Amino acid sequence: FVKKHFVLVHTAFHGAWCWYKIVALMRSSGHNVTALDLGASGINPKQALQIPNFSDYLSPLMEFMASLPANEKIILVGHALGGLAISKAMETFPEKISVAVFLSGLMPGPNIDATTVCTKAGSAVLGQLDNCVTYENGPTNPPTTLIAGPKFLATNVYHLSPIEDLALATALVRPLYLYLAEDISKEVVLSSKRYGSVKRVFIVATENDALKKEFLKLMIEKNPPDEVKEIEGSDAVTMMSKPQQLFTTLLSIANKYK
Amino acid sequence: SPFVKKHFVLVHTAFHGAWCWYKIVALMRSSGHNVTALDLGASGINPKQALQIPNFSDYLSPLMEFMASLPANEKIILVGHALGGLAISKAMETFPEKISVAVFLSGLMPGPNIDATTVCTKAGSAVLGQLDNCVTYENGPTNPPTTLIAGPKFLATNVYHLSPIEDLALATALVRPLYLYLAEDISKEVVLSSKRYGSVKRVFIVATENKKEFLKLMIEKNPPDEVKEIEGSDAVTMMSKPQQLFTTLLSIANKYK
Numbered sequence A: 001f002v003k004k005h006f007v008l009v010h011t012a013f014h015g016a017w018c019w020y021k022i023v024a025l026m027r028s029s030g031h032n033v034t035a036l037d038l039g040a041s042g043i044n045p046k047q048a049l050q051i052p053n054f055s056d057y058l059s060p061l062m063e064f065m066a067s068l069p070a071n072e073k074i075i076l077v078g079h080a081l082g083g084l085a086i087s088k089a090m091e092t093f094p095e096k097i098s099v100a101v102f103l104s105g106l107m108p109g110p111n112i113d114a115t116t117v118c119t120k121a122g123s124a125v126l127g128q129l130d131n132c133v134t135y136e137n138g139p140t141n142p143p144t145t146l147i148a149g150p151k152f153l154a155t156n157v158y159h160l161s162p163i164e165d166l167a168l169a170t171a172l173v174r175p176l177y178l179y180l181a182e183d184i185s186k187e188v189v190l191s192s193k194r195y196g197s198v199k200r201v202f203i204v205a206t207e208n209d210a211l212k213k214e215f216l217k218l219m220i221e222k223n224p225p226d227e228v229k230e231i232e233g234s235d236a237v238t239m240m241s242k243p244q245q246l247f248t249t250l251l252s253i254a255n256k257y258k
Numbered sequence B: 001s002p003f004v005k006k007h008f009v010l011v012h013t014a015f016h017g018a019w020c021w022y023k024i025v026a027l028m029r030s031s032g033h034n035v036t037a038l039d040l041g042a043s044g045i046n047p048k049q050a051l052q053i054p055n056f057s058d059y060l061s062p063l064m065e066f067m068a069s070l071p072a073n074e075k076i077i078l079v080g081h082a083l084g085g086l087a088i089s090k091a092m093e094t095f096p097e098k099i100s101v102a103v104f105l106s107g108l109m110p111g112p113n114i115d116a117t118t119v120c121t122k123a124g125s126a127v128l129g130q131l132d133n134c135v136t137y138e139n140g141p142t143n144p145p146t147t148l149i150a151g152p153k154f155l156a157t158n159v160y161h162l163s164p165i166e167d168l169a170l171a172t173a174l175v176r177p178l179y180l181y182l183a184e185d186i187s188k189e190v191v192l193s194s195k196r197y198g199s200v201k202r203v204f205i206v207a208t209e210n211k212k213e214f215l216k217l218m219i220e221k222n223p224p225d226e227v228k229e230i231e232g233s234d235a236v237t238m239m240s241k242p243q244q245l246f247t248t249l250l251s252i253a254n255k256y257k
């Protein structure tokens, strides 16, 4: 047995809260675990309109990374959009991350940039069902914020999770600022000396979506990680739908990658 | 007793937010009822930060607004948890016609007679200075402490002690500070009378293992139309005894149709 430090980064609309099942599992197993709210997510005091810059969004993670004690390594886990966050963290603090885990996460690299993975990720999300956008940047300008609808969540995201967790999400999802492609590319810059030097595992966790799986496959091909693992039966929120499996997978990764 | 579709309105306590009711919400939406769970000021995903709302009417406003916008002839079952007892009390005075039955789940239940002054001072003593709860002095040492912050140990020992462990984790990630409202503010915001507040039906739900003597005391000074019990509940009944709460709420809905 070795005590580990897991660090959990959520996706669009979400927060630290979505990890509650895993947090509990990690804690009562005697491991250390931090689950962070990004900008204007969960109980982060910023509203979405106050963080138009991607660095503002990534800020809770960056400052936490900068705050980590000397001889300490972590297991950095990023879910879906959470992948961009943990990528930037790897480039900036490679000497603090024992291994980075991309749970069906956006995983850009030199051969497939952040601009690419984001336009594609946002295609499945924008316009789907009862989702909606705001126009505080002007009614003739590109949409400002994106808001997850209850029906979108139920049918596209939590479609394989318990009904209480849908309810939980419904009372907690917060709007996401629609960061400009240019801003995201300027922000998430990756080298092979740094980001490339961090051990990296991808977790394919999707079901009943061939197009999404292809996107995850394409990302693994253009930016090959050290390992690829898999969790079957998962909807778009694995920490809700397949939590025991995910915790096992995360403990397994942690122990062998020391 | 035939099933009639009803609308439940759920109101949380200090540090919490609509999220705490997640299990109740799912169970009602499954049964064919309407349910709305609300964030009060600077609770859950409400935009206001606690320091931005030193007046009680601002803590209460999301409920008061919801109540006002309710269509003409619709009545509701209104559930106040603990601190949420004051909010539903205020709502009972302003909009008595709109509430078929008010339900006080271990709630602060002052009457026209026992002032909201006394009730808060008692509620404060068991929270303030308890274990790892800490206060903050944003307006300096000259003035009263500004916010109250619930500590993870206080949560583990006095609030969540009988709840599944994952619910404790959920809470550590979501609890928010609460502005320490002055009892002079609450006194003047919560003005209760026997004509209005008194006209609304009231049920109190005791949580056995929640103070067992203070909750007992409020019933003497302000008698509800009934008392009910849920055994083995901690301070968050909706977390520890959700099904018992859910069925009790159904049962309650019916007797006071």
Ligand SMILES: CCCCC(=O)CC(=O)O
Pocket: A011, A012, A079, A080, A081, A118, A121, A122, A125, A157, A236
């Ligand atoms: C930019 C839109 C976010 C893309 C996603 O990855 C959707 C999700 O995680 O729910």
Ligand SMILES: CCCCC(=O)CC(=O)O
Pocket: B013, B014, B082, B083, B120, B123, B124, B127, B235
């Ligand atoms: C002064 C606020 C105390 C009210 C409470 O009793 C809050 C709780 O449920 O722990």
